[model samples]
Every structure is written in C-alpha cells, then in structure tokens.
Target: NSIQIGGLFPRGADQEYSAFRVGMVQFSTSEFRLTPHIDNLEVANSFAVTNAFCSQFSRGVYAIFGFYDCKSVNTITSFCGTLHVSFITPSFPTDGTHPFVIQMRPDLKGALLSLIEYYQWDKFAYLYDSCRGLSTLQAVLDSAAEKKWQVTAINVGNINNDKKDETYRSLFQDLELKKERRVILDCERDKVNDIVDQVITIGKHVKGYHYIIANLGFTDGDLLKIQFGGANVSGFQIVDYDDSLVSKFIERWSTLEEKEYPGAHTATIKYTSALTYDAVQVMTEAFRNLRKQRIEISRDCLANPAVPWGQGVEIERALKQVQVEGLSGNIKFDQNGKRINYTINIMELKTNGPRKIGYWSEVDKMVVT
Candidate 1:
C-alpha cells in the first residue's frame, strides 16, 4: 500500500528537496511506499501556501514536510491544527506551540546562553537579521542583566533604501571605532557570508576578533574561505557527521548525480537539509506506528464546511511519540511537538578547520570535548 505525503518548498530549496528524496530511499520499505506531492512556492506568499496545503489535504496526505519562512509558517501551522494533519518543519521554532505542528529544530536559546557563559564573554555586539533572530536576541538580553553582559545590538537586515555592501562596511567600521572585537552573529545563513565578506574587506583587526555564529548550521556554509587570519570563530552544529549513520548517508549522498539530486554533490550537508531528511524519518516512523493500529487516512479539504481527516489525531500522536536516531541526532518530541533531550555540538574554527570543541544537552548542559 502507498501513503501520500506533501512537501512545501521555496522555489529553489534544492538541497532540502534532495535530502527528502534521500530519506525516502533510505526509509521506504517494499511493503509500503511513500508517494510525495511536492509544491514549490515563495514562502512569503501565504495565499499560495494555503492553496498548496489544501491541495495536499484533498490528496489525503498523512503528513506535510518542508521549510516554511516566518511569513508563511503561521498559515501552515493553523491549517494543520484545524485539519488535524501533522505539519513537520525544519524551520526555526515558532514562538508558541501550535497543535499538530512538529518542529524538528531544537530550541537553541538555552544552548546559546550556556555557550556564552562558557566563554565568559561580558561584552559583545549582537547582530541579527530577521524577526526570528530577535527571539534569541531577547533571550540574550534577558540574561544580560544578571550576567552583567554589555550588549550593543545591531540589525544587519538591509533597509529598503540602503546599499547592502556599503551598509555592512559602515556597520563594521562603527564597530571598529567602538573597539568591539567580540560579536554574536545571529543572522540568516546566507547573510553570514555577506557580513564576513564586509569584515574582511574593511581589514579592521580581523586577527584579534572573535565571532559566534549563532545558528546550528556551522558547517553548512563555506567558513574555510575566511582565510582563518587567527580569528576565533565559533558556532553550533546539530548534525554530527562523525556518527556512523551520518557518514554512511553522506557516502550514499556523494554518489548521487548533482543533475538528478541538486544538493547531493556536497560532503557536508546543511543542517536544514539534514533536518529535512530526519523529518522524513520521523514521518515514516509515525506512519509505521499508525499502520500497526490500522488507522485509515481520509481526504480533507479547506473548502467551506470542511471535513477534517478522521485519523489525523492518531498521526500526530504517533509523530510525537517517535524516538529514533536520524541525521540531526536524537529525534524525540514533547507533548507540544517541540524537540526534547537533543544535543548540539559546539564548533570552533581552528587553524585547520571547524572542530568540535564540546557539546550541549538539557541534562548535562555544556561539556567540552
């Protein structure tokens, strides 16, 4: 028997899409197969997101997976809650818990705080890009009073009227004037490169600076291009590539033709891509559990007088109860569908490359390796 699932992706999320395909190949069994209905739309288009979701709802998908931007995440979450279908995402965790929404990314606030404490940094510049970045920024600020942290917050997100490169250069120049050598960069992944480039161009005492890339995708981008310069760079990683499962998956992933699988040529996978693969694993496990109970999947729609899926509640329960090891490490969720008991590895850019300095978990907090 075949089961249907839906994937929502931005127009060019090739890496995440490729990862989903890899997960399907690894997890699909001969007895049952997963049929994916994929939709690619701009994440800022809420109308399109809703329409795509309804289309999948009509197809009787057991779950929906993919990345959702801040602008469109609410639309998907609310619809999933009302329709009773599970919506799993690798996107940053939303502010409040929405029923039937499974967030695959671990909550990084505690870990981030712990890492800062470990470093004993009393003063630093906080550079953030989007509304999502503010949540973590707020967490840092909230703790600042007690920790006596002197924080200079800057919004690096480009204003409509500003020139991007000049703006970044000016920002770095100001930091230099202020002698701000320690910084926490909590921005979009792509923006990290832009900011770093500006810093390099300015040539403002790069060797003495320290930066903490406040995200789980430490190895996702090209940090090796920074030229080291003896500057201290740190970040967190959710995907432990040293793990046997991850290594084997990487081996298989490297073999896929880049034309057929857009992101398969890389040895180091983005955390979002890894989480997408893990989301598939989680969904497959939930479906397997649901099958044992013989739950029937039913078609649902967003039309007026909509009928919700009959077994969506069961599916959500199965997903929340899933506890398995995937590319993103331990996979488990709380009652609210938030990941729990997960570990994030701390990475430092050494002379050679990014190395794991330690790890952080809920129970033990930060433990240096």
Candidate 2:
C-alpha cells in the first residue's frame, strides 16, 4: 500500500515544491512509495490554511509538509498538534516549541551572534526588516548591552507607497551622516539586494564598508553584483556544494525541464528549497521506521472534536530519532523538535568570489577553514 502525504504551498513556492518532488523520487523505494496531495494557496489566509489542512486530514495523510508565514504557522501548528499529524516545514523557527511540528531550518541566532563576535565589532548599524519579527534583533540588542556595543538600529522594511530607491537612498544618507560603515542587514533576501544596490549607487564610502547579511540564502540572490565595489560582504550558507551528495543532486537538478518544474533548472539551489528536500527525507525515514509497527493512518477532521491518531506520538518519536545526512547537512532533532548539531558555512566575499572562510556549529562554535 502506498503511503499518503500532504503538501501546502504558497503561490510562489515553485522551487520548494520542485525540491519536494525531487526528494520523493530519490527516497522512494520499489516496496515503499509515497503519494502526495498538494494544494497551493496564500499562506497569510488563516481560513484558507485551515480548509486545506482539513482537506488533507480527511485524506488520511501520515504527515504534512509546507512553508508557512508568520500569520498562518500557528494555525497549522495547532491543528497538527491537536490532530496528531506530523507537520514538517522549512519556515523560520518560531519562539516557543510545539509538539508534532518538525522544523527543518537550523536556528541561526546562535550562529549570527557567534559570527558578530568573531568579527570583533563593538559598533555597527542594525538594518532589520520588521516583517521578520524582533526576536533576532532583540537577541542582538541584549548581547550588545552585555558587551557594551554601540548599535544604531533602523527599520528598513518598506511599509508605504513611497519610491523604494528614494527611501533607501535617504536611509543611507542618515548612515553616512553618522559615519556608520559596519552594517548588519537582517532583512528579507530581496531587500538585501535593494539596500546594497543603493549603497553602490551612492558610491561615496562603499569601499570602507563591511556588511553582514543575516540569512542562510546568502548566494541565492545576485550578490555578485557588488564584487567589484571593494566592500566587505559576509553571510551564511547551509548547502555545501562540495559534498558529493549535493553535487549529484545538483547535476540532476540542472537537467530538469523548467517547464515541468518551474525552478529546477537553477544550478544553485536556495536554502529553503534544500530544507524542503530534507524535510521530505526526514518524513520518509520516519515512515519507513514506523512501517514495522503497523501505522494506522486516521481521517481526523478539524471540524470535529479532536480525536488524536493512535500512532501520532510514535510517528513523532520516529522522526526525532532519525539521523540522516541530508542536502542541508546532518539532519537531527532535539527533544523540542528543533534541528541540532548542524553546520552553517561562513562565507566572505573576496577578490575572486565568495569563499568559505570558516563554519559554525553547536559544539565547535566557529572554526576557520
């Protein structure tokens, strides 16, 4: 019998969905197969998220995988916890923990803090996007107080109808006035590009500036545009292209038809998409282990009172016990279902290109390459 799983995607999650499909193909066996039912909707619509979830719940799925934004993550988390269906996601980690929710993305706060310490910077500008919430910024601020760091924080998230270029240019003017050359860009990926473009356009003191992009998808965007500008750029990367498995995956991915898979033609895969692939691997491993125990998938409805699945806890335990080398590196979970013991490569832009100068992990902290 084929096992059933559910996928929920937003309208623009083509790359992540393509990665999910690739993972299914790579992990599926002749004896064991997975059938996926997918629904694409707006992640911000809580009502639509609930409806899609219940639709999967009624289909007797063993697990659900998707990307969830801040608004709809709680809706799915509560539903999965109550109904005893495992929910695996590549979304950014939330504050509190919840049962039956497996977060594939490694927590970056510790790494970010460690990187800043490695740089030995006592003063910098914190340019953060409000859309990402304040937890990381709060951690930075708290650490600053302990270390006596002089920080100038700015909200660069565009919330108005104003011209984007003019707004960014004016913000840069303020930074120039304060003579702040060290910057920590904790904003969305596109915003990172926009801010850097503005810096290049201004071209006054760009050579003396150092920037830290506070995200895992450092190379996903067009950071190469700033290579000749003589600015120091640093960021983190989760997918190690040097790894044999990753290289093989890339070879296959590069050959995929763009028409059939909207985002599979790209040579460099986004970290979120890589995490989605790893999420599928984690789920498949968990299900394979649970196969010996005769899992009885249930059709629990969100509309009805919560009658949890009999095998829910077992599946959750199976998932936590899984230890696999995935596209995103060593995939393992802590007691709280948070990713643990993962390596994030620290990259620095050099005269040639972006090179891995070192890596950070829970055990070793940061080690130079």
Candidate 3:
C-alpha cells in the first residue's frame, strides 16, 4: 500500500490532554489511511503492528513533555521494526538480501533488573527459551551476576517453548528450588505455567512460592491457563494481567474509524508507534516543505534525507535535529541512516504479523537470526 506522511512537529508543544483532541489530529493527518485497505492477511498483519503503534500513542504515557499523548519517552533505540518483507527469510539466493537492523528494546537489561529489584526477589532464575530470544535472558543473567543477585541458573530448554515443571525440575535438581518464597520466573506464560504446575504438584514436597513471572509478549495460548495440582489453567489465569497493547490501538482506531483518520488510533502502546507517526509526519513535512520551497523532492533526497524543512525554515536535520514529534517521541536519524528510534515502542509479535526485532533483527520476524 502507498503511504502518505505528515509534518515535522516540535513535540512537547504543551498540548491538551484530550484523547479526542489528539484523535482528531491523528485521524485528519496523512499518517492515517496511509496504508491501502485490502482484505488480505498481509495487510491485516501490517494493520496489527500498525495498530499496536497507535495504541501506545493514545496512552501518551511517554513523550516530549510528559503528557499522555506527548509524555517523556524513556528509551534510546535500535533499528529493528516488523516492516520490510525482506524480514521474511528470503528463499531465493537474493534471500541473502536483508535490511539493516538493530535492537528494538534497548533497555532489556534495565527492565529485567528493575523488575527483579522491584519485586525484591532474593534470588531469581533465567529460563532461556532459545526459540524466542536468548540474548535477552543472557543479558539479564550477566546483569544479575554484576548486581550480585542470587541467579540460580539459566536452563536452556525448548527451543520454541518451556514447561513449568520442567523448569522446576531443572531448578530442584540444581538445588536452586526453594519453597514458600518469591521466585522470579522469566518465561512465556504457557511455558511458565508448565513450570508452575510442576511446582504445585510437587509443592507438598517443596514449599509455597510466589512468582513474579516475566511473561510479557505472548499470544492467546500464552495467556491461557496453567494446570496446577488442583488449579485449572483458567483458574491460574485468574491471577490477573493487562489486555494486549494491540487491543488498545484497535479501540482508538475504531473510535474515529475512517471518519477522522489522523486522530484515529494506530494499535500500539510502544515508542515505535509514536516515532513512526513522527517519522511519517516528519517526512510529510519535508515533502510539503519541498513543494513550497520549489526544491525537487526525489527518492534520492529521501534516501539521503536532509534537514526537514517547510518551504522557508529548516525544522529538522539528521539525528541531531530531526524535530519530529511522533507517537514514540521526537525522532531523528544518525549518520548511517540508523536511528535511536524508541525509548518505548520496541516490542514483539507471533500470530503471523509484522514485528520489530532487536538483538537479532527488527520489525518483521528475526530474518537475520
């Protein structure tokens, strides 16, 4: 689908806190309806990722001025995004053709460590799911070692997934399993539950333990259940959780629907969405400015983007002065076209959709990994 952009906005402009007002701008912007509306899975997948980006913006938790829609964004950035079909491992010899990539979640170490200390877990264990991403867990492990937290051991189990009991058994055998204590379980939901059920079943021989599980970024099955001794998987899920970020974006998007496009939602609650919006708007502004300035705007100009200008003024330059108030935050590019994209939006995907990858790759599936 063809994409239309907007303008380079100096974010943190001290805007009002009205979802509707923001929605209005969002809907009317070129960024909205920028993609073609086709009933194709490909388009739907793109829509899903796009929506995730928008939902995060609607929250406005982080951005230019600490406003909901323009709050102070918190991440540095990476180059991975779930965009570009080249992300799908090319089957042809040209398959070797892969886009330049970077990590999406730059704060992986900080986030996990913060989670550990926040929960005050005396000891934590990292379950490395090689299938999804191991570097994250590995990084966590290294940080814990540096922080001097009691990291029992990192067990490499299912390349695709891990089970609760298997996780417990691994720990118990390592003599790392402690009862009636708080254990920080870093794993996908279903897999973590597999470990949970094993613990429940063997709790009689073990001890009651509360788990601050790092079960982020998963699907319906991941959110499903954990069959503990007598606890049904559904009962386990009763523990609690937040709805996916993707859902929030859909709600916002639906509000304006096609009626008011730019102000509408983009189905995301991460920094990427904001930055993306900002990027499009920034590009739009540059293009618009070029038209007004009578400068020839060409693909080459875009490839080697110059300072974003609007007819008369240079509003944005490279990474130093991109001047884009996006869904994530203000955006800019480095010398090599790499971007310190998000302090927020770097996230994930599964259900056949586009995704941003960091560490191994960006946006689309881990084509590089």
* lDDT by residue for model 3 (1-369), tens: 123221112232211112323433553454323331111112113333333323322322111111111011111110112211101100001101123211111223334454455446656555554322354566666776787776655554543453344555656566543433445454545556666666666665333444544433322232333433332111111101133333444465446543434434433322222323333344444434444555543212113322222311222221123344433232444432333442322223323331333221122221211
**Considering lDDT, where higher is better, how would the candidates rank from best to worst?**
1, 2, 3
lDDT, model 2: 0.84
- List the candidate 2 regions with Cα displacement exceeding 4 Å: 131-133, 163-166, 225-228, 297-302, 307-310
Model 3, runs deviating above 4 Å: 1-106, 131-133, 159-171, 175-181, 205-207, 215-296, 299-369
Clashing pairs in 1: none
Q: What is the per-residue lDDT of model 2 for residues 127-200, given as tens digits with 9 covering 90 to 100?
A: 88764537688888999999998888888874475436568887877887778989998876667777877887
Q: lDDT value for candidate 1?
A: 0.84
What TM-scores do the predictions have? 0.94, 0.94, 0.43
| Per-model root-mean-square deviation over C-alphas | 2.0, 2.0, 14.4
State each model's CA lDDT, in order.
0.84, 0.84, 0.34
lDDT of 1 by residue, 14-57 (tens): 98898989899989997688899999988778888888998887
